[PDB]
Coordinates of C-alpha atoms and ligand atoms in Angstrom, one line a residue:
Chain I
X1071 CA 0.0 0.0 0.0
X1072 CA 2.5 2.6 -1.0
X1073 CA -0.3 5.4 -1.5
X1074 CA -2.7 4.7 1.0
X1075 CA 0.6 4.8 3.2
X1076 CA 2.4 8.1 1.7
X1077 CA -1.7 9.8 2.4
X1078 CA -1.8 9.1 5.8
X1079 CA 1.8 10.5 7.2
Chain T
X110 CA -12.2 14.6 26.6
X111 CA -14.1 16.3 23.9
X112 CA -17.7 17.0 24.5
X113 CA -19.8 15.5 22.4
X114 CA -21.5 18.8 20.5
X115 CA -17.5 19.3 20.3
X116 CA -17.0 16.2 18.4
X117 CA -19.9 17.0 16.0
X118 CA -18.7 19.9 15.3
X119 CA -15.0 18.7 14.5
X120 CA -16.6 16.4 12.0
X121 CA -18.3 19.1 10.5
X122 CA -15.4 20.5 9.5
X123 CA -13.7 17.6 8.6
X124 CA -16.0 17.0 5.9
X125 CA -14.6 16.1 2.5
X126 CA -15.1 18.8 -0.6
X127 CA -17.1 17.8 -3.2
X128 CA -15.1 15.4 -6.3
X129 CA -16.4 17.4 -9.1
X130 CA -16.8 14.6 -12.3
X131 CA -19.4 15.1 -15.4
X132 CA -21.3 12.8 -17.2
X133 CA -19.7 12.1 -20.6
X134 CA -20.7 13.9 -23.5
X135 CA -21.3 10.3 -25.5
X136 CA -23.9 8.0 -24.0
X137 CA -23.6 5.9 -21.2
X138 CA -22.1 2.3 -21.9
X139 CA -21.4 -0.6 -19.6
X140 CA -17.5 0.5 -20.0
X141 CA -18.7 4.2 -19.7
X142 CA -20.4 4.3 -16.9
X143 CA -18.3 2.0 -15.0
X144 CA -15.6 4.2 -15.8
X145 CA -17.0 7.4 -14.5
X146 CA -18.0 5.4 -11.6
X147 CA -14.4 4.1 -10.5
X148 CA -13.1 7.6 -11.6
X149 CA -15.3 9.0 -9.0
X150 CA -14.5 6.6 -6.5
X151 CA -10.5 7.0 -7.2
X152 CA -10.9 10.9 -6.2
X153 CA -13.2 10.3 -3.7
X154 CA -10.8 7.8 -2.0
X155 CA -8.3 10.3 -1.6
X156 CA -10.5 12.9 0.3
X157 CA -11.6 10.4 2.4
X158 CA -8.2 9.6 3.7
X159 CA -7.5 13.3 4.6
X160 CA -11.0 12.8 6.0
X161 CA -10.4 9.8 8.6
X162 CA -7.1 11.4 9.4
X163 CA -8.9 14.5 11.4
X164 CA -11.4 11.8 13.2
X165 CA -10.6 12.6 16.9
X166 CA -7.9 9.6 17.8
X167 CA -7.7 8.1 14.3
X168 CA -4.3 8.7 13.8
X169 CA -3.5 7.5 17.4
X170 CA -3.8 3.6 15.7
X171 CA -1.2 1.6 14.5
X172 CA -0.6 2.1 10.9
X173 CA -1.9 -1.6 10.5
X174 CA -5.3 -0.6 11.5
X175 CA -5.4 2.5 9.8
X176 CA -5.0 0.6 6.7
X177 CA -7.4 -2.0 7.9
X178 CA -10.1 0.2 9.1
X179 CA -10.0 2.1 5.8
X180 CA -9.6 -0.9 3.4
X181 CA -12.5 -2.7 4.7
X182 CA -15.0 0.2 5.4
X183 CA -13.8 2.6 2.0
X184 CA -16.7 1.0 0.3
X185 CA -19.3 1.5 3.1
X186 CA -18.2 5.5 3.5
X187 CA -18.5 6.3 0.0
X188 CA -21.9 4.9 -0.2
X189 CA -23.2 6.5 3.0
X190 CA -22.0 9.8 1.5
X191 CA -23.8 9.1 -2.0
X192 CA -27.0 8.3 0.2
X193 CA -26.4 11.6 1.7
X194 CA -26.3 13.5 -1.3
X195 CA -29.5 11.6 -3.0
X196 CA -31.9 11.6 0.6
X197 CA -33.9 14.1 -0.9
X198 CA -33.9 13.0 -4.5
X199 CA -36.0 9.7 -4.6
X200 CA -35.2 7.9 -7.7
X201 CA -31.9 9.4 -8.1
X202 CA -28.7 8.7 -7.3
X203 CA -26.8 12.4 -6.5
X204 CA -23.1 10.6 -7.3
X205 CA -21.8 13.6 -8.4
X206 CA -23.2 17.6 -8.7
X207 CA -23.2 17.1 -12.4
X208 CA -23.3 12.7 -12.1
X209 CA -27.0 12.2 -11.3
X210 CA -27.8 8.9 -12.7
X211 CA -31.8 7.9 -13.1
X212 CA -32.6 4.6 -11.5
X213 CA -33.5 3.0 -14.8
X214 CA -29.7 3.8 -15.8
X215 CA -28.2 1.0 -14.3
X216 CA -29.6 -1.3 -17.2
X217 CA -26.6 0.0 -18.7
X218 CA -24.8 -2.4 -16.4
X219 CA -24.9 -5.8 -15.8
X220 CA -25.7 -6.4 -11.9
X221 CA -25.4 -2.7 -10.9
X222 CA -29.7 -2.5 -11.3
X223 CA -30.5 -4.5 -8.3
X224 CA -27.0 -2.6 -6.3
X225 CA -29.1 1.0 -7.5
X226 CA -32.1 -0.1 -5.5
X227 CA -30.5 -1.6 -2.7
X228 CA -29.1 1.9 -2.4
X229 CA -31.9 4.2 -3.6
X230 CA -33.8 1.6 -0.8
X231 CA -32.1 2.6 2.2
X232 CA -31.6 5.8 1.4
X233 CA -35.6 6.4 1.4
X234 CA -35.2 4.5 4.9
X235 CA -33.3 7.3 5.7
X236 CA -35.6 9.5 4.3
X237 CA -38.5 8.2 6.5
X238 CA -36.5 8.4 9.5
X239 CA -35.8 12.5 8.7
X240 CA -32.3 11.5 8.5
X241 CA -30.7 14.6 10.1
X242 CA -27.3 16.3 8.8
X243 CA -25.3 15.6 12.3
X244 CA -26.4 12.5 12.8
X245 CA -25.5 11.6 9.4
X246 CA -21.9 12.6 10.5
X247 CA -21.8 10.4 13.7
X248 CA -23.1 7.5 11.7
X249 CA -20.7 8.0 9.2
X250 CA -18.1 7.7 11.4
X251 CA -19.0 4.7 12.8
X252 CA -18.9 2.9 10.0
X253 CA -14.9 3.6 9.5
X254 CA -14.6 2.4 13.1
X255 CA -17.0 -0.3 13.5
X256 CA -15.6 -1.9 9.8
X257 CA -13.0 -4.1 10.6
X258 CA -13.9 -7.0 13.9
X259 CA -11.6 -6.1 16.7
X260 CA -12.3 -8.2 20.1
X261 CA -10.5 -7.2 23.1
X262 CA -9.1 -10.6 23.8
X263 CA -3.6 -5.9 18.3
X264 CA -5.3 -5.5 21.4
X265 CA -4.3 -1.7 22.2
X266 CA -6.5 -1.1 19.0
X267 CA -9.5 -3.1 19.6
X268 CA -9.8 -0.8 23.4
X269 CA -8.8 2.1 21.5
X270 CA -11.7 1.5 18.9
X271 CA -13.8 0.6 21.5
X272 CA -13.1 4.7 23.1
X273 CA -13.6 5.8 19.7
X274 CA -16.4 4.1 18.7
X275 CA -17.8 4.8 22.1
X276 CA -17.4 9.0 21.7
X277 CA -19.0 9.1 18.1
X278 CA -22.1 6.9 19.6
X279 CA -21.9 9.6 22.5
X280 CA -22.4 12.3 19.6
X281 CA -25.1 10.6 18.0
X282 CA -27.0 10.1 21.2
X283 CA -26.1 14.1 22.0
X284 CA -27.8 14.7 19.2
X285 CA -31.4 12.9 19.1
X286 CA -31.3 14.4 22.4
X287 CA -31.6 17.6 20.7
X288 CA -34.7 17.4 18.9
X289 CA -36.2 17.4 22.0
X290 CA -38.3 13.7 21.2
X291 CA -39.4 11.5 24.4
X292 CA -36.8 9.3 26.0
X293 CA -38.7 6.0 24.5
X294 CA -38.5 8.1 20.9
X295 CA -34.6 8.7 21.4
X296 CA -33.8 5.3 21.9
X297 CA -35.5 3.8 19.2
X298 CA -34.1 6.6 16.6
X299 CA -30.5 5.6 17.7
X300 CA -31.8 1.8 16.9
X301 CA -33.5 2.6 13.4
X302 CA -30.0 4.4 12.5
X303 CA -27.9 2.1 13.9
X304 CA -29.8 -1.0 12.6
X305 CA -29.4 0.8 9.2
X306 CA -25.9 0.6 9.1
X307 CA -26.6 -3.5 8.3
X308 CA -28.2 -2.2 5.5
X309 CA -24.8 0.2 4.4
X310 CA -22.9 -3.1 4.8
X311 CA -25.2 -5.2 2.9
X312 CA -25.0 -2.5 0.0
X313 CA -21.2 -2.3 0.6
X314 CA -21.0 -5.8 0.2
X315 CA -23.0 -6.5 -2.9
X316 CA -21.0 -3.5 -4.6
X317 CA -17.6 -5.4 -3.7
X318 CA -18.7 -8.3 -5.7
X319 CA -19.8 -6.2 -8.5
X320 CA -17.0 -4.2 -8.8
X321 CA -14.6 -7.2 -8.7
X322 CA -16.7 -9.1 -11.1
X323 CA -16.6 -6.5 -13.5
X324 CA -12.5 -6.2 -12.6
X325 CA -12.5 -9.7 -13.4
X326 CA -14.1 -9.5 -16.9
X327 CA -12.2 -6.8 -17.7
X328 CA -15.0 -4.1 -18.2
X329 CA -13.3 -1.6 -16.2
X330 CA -9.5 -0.9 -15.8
X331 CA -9.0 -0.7 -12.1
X332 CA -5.8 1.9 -11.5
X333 CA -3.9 3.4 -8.6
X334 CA -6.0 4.3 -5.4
X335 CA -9.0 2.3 -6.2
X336 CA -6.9 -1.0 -7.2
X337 CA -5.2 -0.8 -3.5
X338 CA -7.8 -0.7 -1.6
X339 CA -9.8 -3.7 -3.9
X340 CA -6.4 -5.5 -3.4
Chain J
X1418 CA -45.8 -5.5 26.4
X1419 CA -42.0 -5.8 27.0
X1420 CA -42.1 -8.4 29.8
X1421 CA -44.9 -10.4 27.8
X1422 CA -43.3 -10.1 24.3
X1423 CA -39.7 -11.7 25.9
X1424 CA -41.3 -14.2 27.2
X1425 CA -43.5 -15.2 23.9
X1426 CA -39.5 -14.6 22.4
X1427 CA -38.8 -17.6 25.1
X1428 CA -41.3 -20.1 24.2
X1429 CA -40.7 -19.5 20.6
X1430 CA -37.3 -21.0 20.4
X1431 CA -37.0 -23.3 18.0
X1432 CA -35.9 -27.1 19.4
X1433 CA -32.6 -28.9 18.9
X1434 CA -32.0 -29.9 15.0
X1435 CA -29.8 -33.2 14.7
X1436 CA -28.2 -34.2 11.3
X1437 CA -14.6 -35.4 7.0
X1438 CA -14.3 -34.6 3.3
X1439 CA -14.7 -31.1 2.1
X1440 CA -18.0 -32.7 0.2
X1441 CA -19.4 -34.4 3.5
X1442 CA -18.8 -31.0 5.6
X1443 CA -20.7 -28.8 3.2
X1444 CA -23.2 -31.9 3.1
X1445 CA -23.9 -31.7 6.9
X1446 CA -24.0 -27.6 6.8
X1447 CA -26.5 -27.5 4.0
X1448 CA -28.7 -30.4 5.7
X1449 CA -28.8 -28.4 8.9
X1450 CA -29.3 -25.4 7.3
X1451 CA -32.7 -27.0 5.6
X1452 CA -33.9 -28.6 8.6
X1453 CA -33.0 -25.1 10.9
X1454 CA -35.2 -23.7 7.8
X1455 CA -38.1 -25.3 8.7
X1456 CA -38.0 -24.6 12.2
X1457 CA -37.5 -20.6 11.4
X1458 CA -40.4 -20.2 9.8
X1459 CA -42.1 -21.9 12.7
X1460 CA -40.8 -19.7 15.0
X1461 CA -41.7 -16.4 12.9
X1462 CA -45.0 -17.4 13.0
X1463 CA -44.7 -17.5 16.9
X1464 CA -44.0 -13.8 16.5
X1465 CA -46.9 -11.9 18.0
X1466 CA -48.3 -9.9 15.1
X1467 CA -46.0 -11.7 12.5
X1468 CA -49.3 -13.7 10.9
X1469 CA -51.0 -10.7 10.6
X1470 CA -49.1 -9.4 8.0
X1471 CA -49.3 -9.9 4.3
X1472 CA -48.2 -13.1 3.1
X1473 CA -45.9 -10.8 0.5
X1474 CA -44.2 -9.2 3.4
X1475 CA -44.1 -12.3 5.5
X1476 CA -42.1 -14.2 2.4
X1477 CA -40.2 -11.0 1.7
X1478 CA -38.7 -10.5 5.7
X1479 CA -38.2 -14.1 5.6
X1480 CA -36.1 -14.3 2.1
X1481 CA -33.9 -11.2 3.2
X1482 CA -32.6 -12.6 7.0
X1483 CA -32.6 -16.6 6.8
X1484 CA -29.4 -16.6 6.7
X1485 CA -28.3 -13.8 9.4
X1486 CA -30.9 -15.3 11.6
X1487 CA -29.2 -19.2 11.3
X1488 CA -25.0 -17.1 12.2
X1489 CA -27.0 -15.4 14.5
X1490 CA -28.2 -18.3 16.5
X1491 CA -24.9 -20.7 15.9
X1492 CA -23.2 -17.6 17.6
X1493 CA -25.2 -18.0 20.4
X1494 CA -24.3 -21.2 20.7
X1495 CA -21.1 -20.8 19.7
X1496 CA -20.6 -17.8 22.7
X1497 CA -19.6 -19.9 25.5
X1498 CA -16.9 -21.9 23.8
X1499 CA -13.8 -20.0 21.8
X1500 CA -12.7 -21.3 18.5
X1501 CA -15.4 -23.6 18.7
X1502 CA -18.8 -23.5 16.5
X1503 CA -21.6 -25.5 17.9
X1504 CA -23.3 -26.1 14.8
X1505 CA -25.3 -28.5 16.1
X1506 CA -25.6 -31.2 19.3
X1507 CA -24.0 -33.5 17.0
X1508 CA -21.7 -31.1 14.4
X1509 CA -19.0 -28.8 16.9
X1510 CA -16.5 -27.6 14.7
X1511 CA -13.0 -26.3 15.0
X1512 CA -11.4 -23.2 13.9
X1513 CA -8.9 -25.4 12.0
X1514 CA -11.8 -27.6 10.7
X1515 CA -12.2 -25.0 8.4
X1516 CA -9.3 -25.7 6.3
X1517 CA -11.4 -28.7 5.0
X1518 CA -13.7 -26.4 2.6
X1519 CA -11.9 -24.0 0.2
X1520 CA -12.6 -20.2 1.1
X1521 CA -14.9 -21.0 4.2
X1522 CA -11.9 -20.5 7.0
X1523 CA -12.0 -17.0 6.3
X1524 CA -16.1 -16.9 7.3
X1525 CA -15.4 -19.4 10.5
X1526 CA -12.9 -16.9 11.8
X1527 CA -15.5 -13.8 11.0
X1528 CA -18.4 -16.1 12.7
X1529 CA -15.9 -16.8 15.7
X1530 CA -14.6 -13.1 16.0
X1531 CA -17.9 -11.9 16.2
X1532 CA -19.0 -14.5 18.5
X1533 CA -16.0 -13.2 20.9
X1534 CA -17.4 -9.7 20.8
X1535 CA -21.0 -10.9 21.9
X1536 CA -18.8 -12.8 24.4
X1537 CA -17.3 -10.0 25.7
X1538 CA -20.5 -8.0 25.5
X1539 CA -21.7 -10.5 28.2
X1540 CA -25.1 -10.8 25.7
X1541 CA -27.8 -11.7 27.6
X1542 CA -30.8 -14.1 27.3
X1543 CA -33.1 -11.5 26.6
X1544 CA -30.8 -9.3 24.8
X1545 CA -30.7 -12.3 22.2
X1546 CA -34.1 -13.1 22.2
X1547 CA -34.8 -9.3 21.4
X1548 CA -32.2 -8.9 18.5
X1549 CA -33.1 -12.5 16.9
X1550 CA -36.3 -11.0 16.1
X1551 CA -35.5 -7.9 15.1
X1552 CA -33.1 -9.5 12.5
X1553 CA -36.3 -10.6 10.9
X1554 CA -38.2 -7.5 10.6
X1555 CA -35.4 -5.2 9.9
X1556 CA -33.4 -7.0 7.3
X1557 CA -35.7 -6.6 4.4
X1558 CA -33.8 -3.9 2.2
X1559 CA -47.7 -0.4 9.0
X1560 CA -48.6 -3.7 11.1
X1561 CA -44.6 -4.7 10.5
X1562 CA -43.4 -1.3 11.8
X1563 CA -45.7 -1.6 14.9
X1564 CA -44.2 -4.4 15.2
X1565 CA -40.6 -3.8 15.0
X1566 CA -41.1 -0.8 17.2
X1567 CA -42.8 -3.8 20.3
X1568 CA -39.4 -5.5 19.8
X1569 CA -37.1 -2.8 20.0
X1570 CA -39.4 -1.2 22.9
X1571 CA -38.4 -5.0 24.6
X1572 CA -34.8 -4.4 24.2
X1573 CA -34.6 -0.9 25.7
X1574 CA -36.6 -2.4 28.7
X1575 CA -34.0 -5.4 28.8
X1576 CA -30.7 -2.8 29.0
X1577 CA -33.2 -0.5 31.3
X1578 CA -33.8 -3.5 33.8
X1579 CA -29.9 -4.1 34.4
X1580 CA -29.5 -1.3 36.3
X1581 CA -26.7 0.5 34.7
X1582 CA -26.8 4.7 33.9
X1583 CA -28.2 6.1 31.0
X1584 CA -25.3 7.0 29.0
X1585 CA -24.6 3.3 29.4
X1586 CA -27.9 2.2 28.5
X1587 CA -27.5 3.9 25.2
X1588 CA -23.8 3.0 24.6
X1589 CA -24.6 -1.0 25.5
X1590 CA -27.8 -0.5 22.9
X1591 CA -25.1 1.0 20.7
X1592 CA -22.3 -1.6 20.7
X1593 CA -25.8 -4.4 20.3
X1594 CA -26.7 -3.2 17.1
X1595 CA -23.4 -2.7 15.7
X1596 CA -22.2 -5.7 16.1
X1597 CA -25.4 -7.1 13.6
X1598 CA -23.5 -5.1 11.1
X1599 CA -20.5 -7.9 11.1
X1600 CA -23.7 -10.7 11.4
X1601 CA -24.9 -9.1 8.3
X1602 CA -21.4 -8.9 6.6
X1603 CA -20.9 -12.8 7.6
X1604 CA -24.2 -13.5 6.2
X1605 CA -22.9 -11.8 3.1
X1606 CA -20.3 -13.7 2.7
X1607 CA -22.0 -17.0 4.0
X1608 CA -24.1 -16.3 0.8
X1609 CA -21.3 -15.9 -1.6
X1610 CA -19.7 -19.0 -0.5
X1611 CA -22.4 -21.2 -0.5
X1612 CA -23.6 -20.2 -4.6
X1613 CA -20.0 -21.4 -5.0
X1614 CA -20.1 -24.3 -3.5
X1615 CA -23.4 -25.1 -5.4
X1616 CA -21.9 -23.9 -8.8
X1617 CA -18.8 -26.0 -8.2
X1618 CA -21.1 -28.7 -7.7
X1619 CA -19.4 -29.3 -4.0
X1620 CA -22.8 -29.4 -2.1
X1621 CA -25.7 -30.5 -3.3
X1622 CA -28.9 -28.1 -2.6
X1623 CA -32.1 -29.4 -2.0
X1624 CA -36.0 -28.5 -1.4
X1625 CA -36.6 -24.8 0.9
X1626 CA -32.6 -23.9 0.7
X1627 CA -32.8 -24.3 -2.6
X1628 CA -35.3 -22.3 -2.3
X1629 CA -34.2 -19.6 -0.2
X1630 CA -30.7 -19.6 -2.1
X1631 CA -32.9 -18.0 -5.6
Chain M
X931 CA -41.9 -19.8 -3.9
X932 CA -44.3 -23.0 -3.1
X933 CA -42.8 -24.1 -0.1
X934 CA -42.5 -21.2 1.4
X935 CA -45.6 -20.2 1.0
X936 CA -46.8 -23.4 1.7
X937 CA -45.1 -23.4 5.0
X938 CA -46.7 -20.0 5.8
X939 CA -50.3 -20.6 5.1
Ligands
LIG226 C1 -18.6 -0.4 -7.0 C2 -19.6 0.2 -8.1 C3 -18.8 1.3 -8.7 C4 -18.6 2.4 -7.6 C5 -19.9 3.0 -6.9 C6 -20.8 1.8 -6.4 C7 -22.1 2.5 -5.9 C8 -21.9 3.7 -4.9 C9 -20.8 4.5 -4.8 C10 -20.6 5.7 -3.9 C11 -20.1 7.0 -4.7 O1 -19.7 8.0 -3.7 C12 -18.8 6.6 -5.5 C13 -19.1 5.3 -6.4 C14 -19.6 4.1 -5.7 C15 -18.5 3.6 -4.7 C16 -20.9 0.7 -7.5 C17 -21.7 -0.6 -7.3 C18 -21.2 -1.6 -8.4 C19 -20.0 -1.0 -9.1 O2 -18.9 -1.9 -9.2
LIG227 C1 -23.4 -21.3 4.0 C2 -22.3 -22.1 4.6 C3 -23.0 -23.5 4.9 C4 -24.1 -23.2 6.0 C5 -23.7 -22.6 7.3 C6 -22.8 -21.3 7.1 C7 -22.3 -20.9 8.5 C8 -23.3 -20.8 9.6 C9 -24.5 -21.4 9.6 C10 -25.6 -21.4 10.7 C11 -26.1 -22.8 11.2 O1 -27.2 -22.7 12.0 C12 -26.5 -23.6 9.9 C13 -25.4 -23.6 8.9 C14 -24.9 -22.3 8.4 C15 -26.1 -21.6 7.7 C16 -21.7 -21.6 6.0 C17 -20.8 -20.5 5.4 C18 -20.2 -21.0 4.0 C19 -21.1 -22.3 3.6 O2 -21.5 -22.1 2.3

């Protein structure tokens, strides 16, 4: 999940 | 330690802007209209992060539940929001400002009819029940935190979605109380709404079948935000 | 009333239904699931008021929760016992039975986590009695909402009767219904599996869940 | 849906 990771910091 | 009108509030303000998509000039198709749908939900997706990130405590989880909570509820949140939009529209499905699809449009797509009236269906529940604006925010929320099953025997998560879960139903009870409505009228309105969030799930669901049916027939491309979270 | 509409809930129960290869699994699940048919519709008609209504809405309510109302119930037995599922007197079944039938572990550790939460809930007797039936009325997608208002009436007058504040009244009404959110997302995906099974021609499907499967 | 409204009536 590299976007749903890089959104949420 | 955030009153409960203050937690309304807060989610009032954390409320996504509107994803601004347009019907296509050329007529709807199968392919067409899936793809302005999955479009729609791609933007969407990525307001709705920014969205759960301002939810009092969210960000307080692990980053495995964050991605947990938000895989397995994405689905659920988008369509509580379109029921939202179309609660005063019966017949009509408000996806968009300029995306208002007709009930009889989802002929256009295999399998998406009987998904339109499952949702054009509990939105008129909604309807019925005078589905207020701040308690559509409290139940909202609770769907992103009551998605994923967390017993108590992580378990720092499943006591810290239990505190969460437990100040949004605080909210929602804050405001039935409100409207001024007997005691033996408030609790069964927080049991209509909260018995309607089976409904949410059951349309939820039925639209994650769909959408990976038609993934799987190659109808619609699937791309970037939207193929993560059907991953 | 509340204190007379628990105890009709009471009386109601249905009795005791008494029926490995992947094949013989999903052979005893199905057969219990037809025989536990049977007896549902039985106990619906137990339902004060539930006769009264149109036999269009009687079919429809039934068609819509048949299979929430059957997780429902094996939870219930199920509550008392972790990583167990007491299907049946005869049929317990382990957590890691489940790796006997392709794609149904996944739905024994949703029906178990679930189960763990009604657990720790502490659900009562009455509390059960009251949701079981609201299952019914409420899952469909006049007399029926006089009804389903009786039933929830009995359930606020359960949580009333234990003593505890209001604020926890309402919170323990709140975590209640929620938690038929995740009975309603296992019945989902109860339903999914079992069309598989039937279109891989694993289980066989015969007579009312057959039926109740179209 | 005989049976079920068999069962019913
Ligand atoms: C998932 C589907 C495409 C996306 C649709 C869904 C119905 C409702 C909604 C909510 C709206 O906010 C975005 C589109 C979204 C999420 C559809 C049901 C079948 C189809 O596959
Ligand atoms: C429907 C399945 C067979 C029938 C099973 C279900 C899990 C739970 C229950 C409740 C019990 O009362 C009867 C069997 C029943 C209804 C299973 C999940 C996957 C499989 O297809």
């Amino acid at each position: 999940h590299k976007i749903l990771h890089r959104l949420l910091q | 330690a955030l009153s409960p009108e203050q937690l309304v509030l807060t989610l009032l303000e954390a409320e996504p802007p509107h994803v601004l998509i347009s019907r296509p000039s050329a007529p709807f198709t199968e392919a067409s209209m899936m793809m302005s749908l999955t479009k729609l939900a791609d933007k969407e997706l990525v307001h709705m992060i920014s969205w759960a990130k301002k939810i009092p405590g969210f960000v307080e989880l692990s980053l495995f539940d964050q991605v947990r909570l938000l895989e397995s509820c994405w689905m659920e949140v988008l369509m509580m929001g379109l029921m939202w939009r179309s609660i005063d529209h019966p017949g009509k499905l408000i996806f968009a400002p300029d995306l208002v699809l007709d009930r009889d449009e989802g002929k256009c797509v295999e399998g998406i009819l009987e998904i339109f009236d499952m949702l054009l269906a509990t939105t008129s529940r909604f309807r019925e029940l005078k589905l207020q604006h701040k308690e559509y925010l409290c139940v909202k929320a609770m769907i992103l935190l009551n998605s994923s099953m967390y017993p108590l025997v992580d378990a720092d998560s499943s006591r810290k979605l239990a505190h969460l879960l437990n100040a949004v139903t605080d909210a929602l009870v804050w405001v039935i109380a409100k409207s001024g409505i007997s005691s033996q009228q408030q609790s069964m309105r927080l049991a209509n709404l909260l018995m309607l969030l089976s409904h949410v799930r059951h349309a939820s669901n039925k639209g994650m079948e769909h959408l990976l049916n038609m993934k799987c027939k190659n109808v619609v491309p699937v791309y970037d935000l939207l193929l993560e979270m059907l991953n």
